[PDB]
Amino acid sequence: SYNYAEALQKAIYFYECQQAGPLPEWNRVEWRGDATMNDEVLGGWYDAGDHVKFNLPMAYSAAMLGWALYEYGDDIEASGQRLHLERNLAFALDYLVACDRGDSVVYQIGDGAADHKWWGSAEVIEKEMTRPYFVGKGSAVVGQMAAALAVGSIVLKNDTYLRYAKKYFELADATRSDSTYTAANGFYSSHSGFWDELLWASTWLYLATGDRNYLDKAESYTPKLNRQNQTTDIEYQWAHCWDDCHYGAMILLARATGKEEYHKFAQMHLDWWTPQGYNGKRVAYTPGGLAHLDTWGPLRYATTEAFLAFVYADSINDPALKQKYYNFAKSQIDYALGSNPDNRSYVVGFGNNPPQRPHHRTAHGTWLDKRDIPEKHRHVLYGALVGGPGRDDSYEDNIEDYVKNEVACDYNAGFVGALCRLTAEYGGTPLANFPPPEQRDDEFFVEAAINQASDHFTEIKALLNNRSSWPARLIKDLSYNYYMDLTEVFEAGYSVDDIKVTIGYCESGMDVEISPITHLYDNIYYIKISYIDGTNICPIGQEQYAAELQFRIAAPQGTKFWDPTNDFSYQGLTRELAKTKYMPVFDGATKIFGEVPGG
Amino acid sequence: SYNYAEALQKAIYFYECQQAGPLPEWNRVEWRGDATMNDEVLGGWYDAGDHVKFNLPMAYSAAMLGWALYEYGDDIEASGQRLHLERNLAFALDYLVACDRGDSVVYQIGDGAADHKWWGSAEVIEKEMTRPYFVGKGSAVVGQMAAALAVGSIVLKNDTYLRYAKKYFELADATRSDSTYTAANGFYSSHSGFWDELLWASTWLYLATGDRNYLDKAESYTPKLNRQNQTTDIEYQWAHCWDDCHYGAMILLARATGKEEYHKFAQMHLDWWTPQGYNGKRVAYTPGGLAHLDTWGPLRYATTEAFLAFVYADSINDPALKQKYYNFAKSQIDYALGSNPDNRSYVVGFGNNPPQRPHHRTAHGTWLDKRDIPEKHRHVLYGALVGGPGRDDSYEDNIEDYVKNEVACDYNAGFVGALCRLTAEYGGTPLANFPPPEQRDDEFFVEAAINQASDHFTEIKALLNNRSSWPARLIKDLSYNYYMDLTEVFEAGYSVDDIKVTIGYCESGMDVEISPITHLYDNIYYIKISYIDGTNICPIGQEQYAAELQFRIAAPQGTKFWDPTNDFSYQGLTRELAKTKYMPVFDGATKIFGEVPGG
Ligand SMILES: OC[C@H]1O[C@@H](O[C@H]2[C@H](O)[C@@H](O)[C@H](O)O[C@@H]2CO)[C@H](O)[C@@H](O)[C@@H]1O
Ligand SMILES: OC[C@H]1O[C@@H](O[C@H]2[C@H](O)[C@@H](O)[C@H](O)O[C@@H]2CO)[C@H](O)[C@@H](O)[C@@H]1O
Ligand SMILES: [Br-]
Ligand SMILES: [Br-]
Ligand SMILES: [Br-]
Ligand SMILES: [Br-]
Ligand SMILES: [Br-]
Ligand SMILES: [Br-]
Ligand SMILES: [Ca+2]
Ligand SMILES: [Ca+2]
Ligand SMILES: [Ca+2]
Ligand SMILES: [Ca+2]
Ligand SMILES: [Cl-]
Ligand SMILES: [Cl-]
Ligand SMILES: [Cl-]
Ligand SMILES: [Cl-]
Ligand SMILES: [Cl-]
Ligand SMILES: [Cl-]
Ligand SMILES: [Cl-]
Ligand SMILES: [Cl-]
Ligand SMILES: [Cl-]
Structure with a gap:
């Protein structure tokens, strides 16, 4: 329906736009230079259109890029994007390793409130403010770091990543507390708690090592997961996301163990996302066909669920279920790319009538701490999936709309996996001269x-x-x-x-x-x-x-x-x-x- | 008692503090330099603690200093102050002559609002603002200019002053209107109208020339004077002052003509000022014994009436009346010098506990366009009679009290005449080394x-x-x-x-x-x-x-x-x-x- 190979190419390139200093020799973004070189831990990604390094969503995003490779890495070699995805992942994982502090980790660089108060480009922020770092042992943030490193160790065939995945998992599992995770409160607060992260990390460690001790740990966490409202079912009425990866973990465990409890959960959860719902319960849908979980980043949640649905559908044999989940997944990706009431892409620099004013400081390129000047972005944030439309499919491309025009590492992460699945199936030719030089x-x-x-x-x-x-x-x-x-x-x-x-x-x-x-x-x-x-x-x-x-x-x-x-x-x-x-x-x-x- | 010679010495010196540039060679004030040298008409006096030249009170003040010399010039030669008073008067008269513009006169230099909005020294005001001049032929202002030059011509034996006195009187008498007197509005508006000025000027021209035509003109104006309330009597319940000199004119006419109507007026007016009153009617008195006409400049009004009372008392033979008026006069001057509930002088730089914070920009000596800094005046405004206490004898020496600590040419003018009379009687030695150098x-x-x-x-x-x-x-x-x-x-x-x-x-x-x-x-x-x-x-x-x-x-x-x-x-x-x-x-x-x- 779209050139998914070009979409994937651009969605990966987005992460190069997010890189903190020092930039790798292969960084392809002419408007990015070394930035925040006085940071306590170098490299990794800025979170969104800001300059904070928030390890929870950063590690989540890396784990999802790892998962994309784990499922579809061989199947995307024809798109020409596998090497791009791999080295972009490795950049984030190197940062996670560099955060190690033994009995704790650096879990944040930059103060959210101070960072967000100022509008300007990454390369000059040290002239405006001095950036703090934060150390702690939060089970959710450390657990997510472990998971990213675990899947990373598999897809990048890297023993150092596995060593650090074990270190971090052992720390998170020993600590069993988010009390030292505070610097991201109000930005990336731990909402669901940490049991889902321990589940997610131990699942990936089992997939990495084949060590059943990890599968025993994983299964031990499931009764500790949050319940759906006041019932006995594990919570299913939300999306796999930076805060809560139990969804994806349950899918992986359904496939790894074949156990019925995991399949039951996966089907209940995915059914709630599909237009038919789960026994009369369903995520809100826009009339234009977008599953719309929340005001903030609805495209992020829907496209992430598309990736889970593709992986689950590929892992089962029932024709009806496969077709139902596949159709759901493709419908959500296609909405993001232009199959919506405005026929417009919600991916910057891609497709028909893409957003041109993403809420992104360095892509904008101001000189005077204002959003309205320059009135046009100086740079193209290729590949960025924006927050997206409201519940009624409404949207205006406006830099001031910090909800609908938000962009972030986590918005792109599941999206990349889904695009890998679609390029695998439909092919497509990436753009040869990409990226073209800017005026x-x-x-x-x-x-x-x-x-x-x-x-x-x-x-x-x-x-x-x-x-x-x-x-x-x-x-x-x-x-x-x-x-x-x-x-x-x-x-x-x-x-x-x-x-x-x-x-x-x-x-x-x-x-x-x-x-x-x-x-x-x-x-x-x-x-x-x-x-x-x-x-x-x-x-x-x-x-x-x-x-x-x-x-x-x-x-x-x-x-x-x-x-x-x-x-x-x-x-x-x-x-x-x-x-x-x-x-x-x-x-x-x-x-x-x-x-x-x-x- | 008091050293009235010293008080007179200082009261005259006040006028040297008020001189606009170019200063005469004999100016004794170390903290005064040539100021306002770009003015349309040079010299003359700044009116108060400001830098406007307002000709109505300036001319009135000059006329009163002339009157002091006319009555008491011979009698003060012993105090050593005669030559000081004479050359101080001549400086103002020279300005009045220099105002001539043929069919009109310059009657003001400076915009009152802009002048008063700024707080700083005379010599630097042209760096702050440009000073406009105003031209007109208002009968009150031109008539008072005429009167000042007429008495000035007598006491300074000066034919040029008499020539301009005649010319100005004729202009005022031809014009019979204050319509062209606009720039002093709200500062020195013509409240009484102009008939009293024509009376005062023609009376002085008679005294200067002996030409009975001027006496006939003077007497022709008395039916045009304002009445007392809704009665047929000439107004008598106020003071001789910058706006209305008919009081002193009537006294001069009593002496010059001997006619009963002028003596009846003189005694009605002066009795109203005495504690004994006129037919049960009297000016308000403070408990401390100050005749208190108005909130503004009560000492100015009372000390001016003291001079009139001295002149009238000296002109009659009735020992009872003479004693009544003399006691009144001396009581008011003595109150100003320290015979009051606080035993304190109201003359800057004189006597016991004099005011130290008069509302006077140049004596204050700021550099900051503020009244509160410096907290002490850098210069001594010797001889300035302040506005004075309230009706209850209340007073605080405060630069912010632009009522009680106001100082002005017209405040000092009658006061000088009264001091002339008192030093004539009691002698006194002026200060030998005056003024002493400042720190x-x-x-x-x-x-x-x-x-x-x-x-x-x-x-x-x-x-x-x-x-x-x-x-x-x-x-x-x-x-x-x-x-x-x-x-x-x-x-x-x-x-x-x-x-x-x-x-x-x-x-x-x-x-x-x-x-x-x-x-x-x-x-x-x-x-x-x-x-x-x-x-x-x-x-x-x-x-x-x-x-x-x-x-x-x-x-x-x-x-x-x-x-x-x-x-x-x-x-x-x-x-x-x-x-x-x-x-x-x-x-x-x-x-x-x-x-x-x-x-
Ligand atoms: O309570 C519903 C749902 O919340 C999820 O956390 C949300 C949070 O509610 C939202 O305000 C923030 O913007 O996003 C996070 C992550 O999506 C939480 O992860 C779920 O467990 C929970 O069911
Ligand atoms: O009406 C009383 C009295 O006013 C005299 O004018 C005053 C004026 O009222 C006052 O506001 C101002 O501060 O001073 C002038 C002059 O004293 C006017 O001279 C009198 O004829 C009249 O009796
Ligand atoms: Br291109
Ligand atoms: Br050149
Ligand atoms: Br030249
Ligand atoms: Br005119
Ligand atoms: Br002295
Ligand atoms: Br020296
Ligand atoms: Ca040296
Ligand atoms: Ca969690
Ligand atoms: Ca040249
Ligand atoms: Ca008048
Ligand atoms: Cl800690
Ligand atoms: Cl369906
Ligand atoms: Cl399938
Ligand atoms: Cl753009
Ligand atoms: Cl612009
Ligand atoms: Cl009496
Ligand atoms: Cl006498
Ligand atoms: Cl002083
Ligand atoms: Cl000071």
């Missing part, structure tokens, strides 16, 4: 205005701008030149010593020097304005993105010869601030913007 | 702090202050030096050209240059910070009284030899702003504050 705008440049003109002087207001975005970046050795023609000075009988440079305003905190008037060639002279620590010009807010200087170049009071109309840098200037190419900008000795006289 | 503060100086420090640089925050007050003044060619010892630079094998001067903050609007590092002697070098228009550093407000610059002097990054502790200008600096004598200030090439290495 860039000017990043470092001066805006200038004539602040005052007189018959004996020129006074310039000049703002040296850093609106970098490909990638956002800091340049220390910034300078710009203002060129003049002093022919009229010499003709009137005066010299360079008779021309005085003064300053009328220099912005606080911007260490600056102005050169003496310097000969270029002939009667062409210039001053250089140098910012000694240009990294303080940075796209982090209204005050920081440009440094303002007002400078005056003056012949003696009373003289009548001063003529700025032949001065190179005066060309086109008005009384209103405007970008000018005639006051070129330099990084050290290298010109990075503008033009020079002759030259 | 002065530093006026131009740098406040500096170490803003940032490291092993390769010093960064200074420097505020160049103008808190001048002796007198407040402007200096254009202001600079200050920062002296260093570069011994350690040379000791490291580096040169002067390896040291970098940069700026970290330059206050907006303060055109500034920093010299290259300049040799002084030995290994001592300096930078000069020069303000191109130092007059923008001025004591007119919170942002203007000091120019802020943050400058950094830096050795190359990575070097560790930099040594600020042998730098002359670094001595005593902390991280908090403080005045320093080691960053000396210059006016052109002349040092005006601080110290230099060596000397």
